């Protein structure tokens, strides 16, 4: 994996573009506040920005909101990976591991 | 050819201890076991009657039967692609109380007390345990703690 600390900006972009909820074991695009309210209104999450806020400022219902969010299907990075070989650690000049804050650049490239 | 005996390859397992050989102290006999008690198995090499097998050495089970000088233990043993229930008749010298259950009972009592205090006041007692959280913000001063600069040391043979 490549992981890191996402920003409010990258999280909002991820949710707005590649944002799909898990409703009755089905992947449905968010695309409207109605279904987010219908599936997460018990927890007070009544909009896509409510869900974004719950994800960013990790809340009491972060687990429920995140599990409602379908896994993000990202593309390959549009500018490449910036390394000749991915499967070394980020420290070693590879890709995998913890790019503490560079995950924003990577994920915004893939998204 | 090949040997697979009852006490095969148990040379160090049942070895008594360093400077703990001989007669066993009486607390092991004074300890009492009830049905449903959770017990660890660690065979005493000195006592050869009612000795557990080397498989059950280090296993934790539940008491299902109590007899004159021994106890019945329920152990789930992995056989192929499933667990089978195994019933052992082990002596109290090889049996010992497990402390995980004791810690959990103490936690149960603590949650009962905290819930009683919540019924008294209502201050969000938050019974459930949580993992180690990431550290919050903190400020580190430099009064008598000015940073000391370190550098990589040059190589020396030292021999």
């Amino acid at each position: 994996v490549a992981y890191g600390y996402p920003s409010y900006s990258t999280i909002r972009q991820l949710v707005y573009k590649r944002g799909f909820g898990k409703i009755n074991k089905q992947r449905v695009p968010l695309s409207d506040n109605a279904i987010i309210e219908a599936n997460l209104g018990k927890y007070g999450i009544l909009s896509i920005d409510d869900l974004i806020h719950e994800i960013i400022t990790v809340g009491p219902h972060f687990k429920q909101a995140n599990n409602f969010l379908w896994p993000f299907k990202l593309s390959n990075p549009s500018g490449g990976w910036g390394v000749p070989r991915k499967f070394k650690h980020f420290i070693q000049g590879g890709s995998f591991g913890n790019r503490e804050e560079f995950i924003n650049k990577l994920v915004k490239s893939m998204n | 050819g090949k040997s697979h005996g009852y006490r095969s390859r148990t040379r160090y397992m049942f070895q008594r201890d360093f400077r703990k050989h001989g007669a066993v102290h009486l607390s092991t006999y004074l300890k009492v076991y009830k049905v449903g008690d959770i017990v660890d198995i660690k065979a005493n090499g000195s006592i050869q009657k009612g000795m557990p097998h080397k498989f059950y050495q280090g296993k934790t089970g539940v008491v299902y039967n109590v007899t004159k000088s021994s106890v019945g233990v329920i152990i789930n043993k992995m056989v192929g692609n499933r667990y089978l229930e195994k019933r052992l008749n082990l002596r109290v010298e090889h049996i010992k109380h497990s402390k995980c259950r004791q810690e959990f009972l103490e936690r149960v009592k603590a949650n009962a007390a905290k819930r009683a205090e919540a019924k008294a006041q209502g201050v969000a007692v938050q019974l459930k345990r949580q993992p180690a959280q990431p550290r919050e913000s903190r400020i580190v001063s430099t009064e008598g703690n000015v940073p000391q600069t370190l550098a990589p040391v040059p190589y020396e043979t030292f021999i």
């Binding site: - | 370190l150 040391v153 040059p154």
Partner: protein, 171 residues
């Protein structure tokens, strides 16, 4: 890529028995903040009894060069591992900045001893501006009074494959 220099200050994790530990600092030449912190923990593990789990990093700061457009001499003490042993070496170089100084030092080590980044410890980078402190002749050579040299045999790059007059290497 471009090396930067970071001051990395970190301490052991404060305990109740000992609040406010000694809070040691290093100067780390690294590509980015993540590698800077990683190298800080590497060297701290090499010197004192602490690791990333048992400690914390209290400050990381880019140290920019004081005058990044002046030419000075740099003495670099390094320690590196060959295919057979560990050796300390001392090299003198000329650059405008310490970070580029260390970058070309790494290039030089790779070119002359096949020493990769992993097998090099930058013991020290010291800036000297006074001559007779420089010891290497390949720097004393450009430390000459009123130095001037030509560049013979100029090769000019052509974007088109075919040229219609025979080239000249005058300069």
């Amino acid at each position: 890529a471009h090396f930067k220099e970071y001051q990395v200050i970190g301490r052991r994790l404060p305990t109740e028995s000992v609040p406010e530990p000694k809070l040691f600092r290093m100067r780390i030449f690294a590509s980015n903040e993540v590698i800077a912190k990683s190298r800080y923990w590497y060297f701290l593990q090499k010197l004192h009894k602490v690791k990333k789990a048992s400690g914390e990093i209290v400050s990381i700061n880019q140290i920019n060069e004081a005058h990044p457009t002046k030419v000075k001499n740099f003495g670099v003490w390094v320690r590196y591992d060959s295919r057979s042993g560990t050796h300390n070496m001392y090299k003198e170089i000329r650059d405008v900045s310490r970070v580029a100084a260390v970058e070309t030092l790494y290039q030089d080590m790779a070119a002359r001893h096949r020493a990769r980044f992993r097998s090099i410890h930058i013991l020290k980078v010291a800036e000297i501006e006074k001559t007779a402190d420089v010891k290497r002749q390949y720097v004393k050579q450009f430390l000459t009074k009123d130095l001037k040299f030509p560049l013979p045999h100029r090769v000019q790059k052509s974007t088109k494959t075919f040229s219609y007059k025979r080239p000249s290497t005058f300069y």
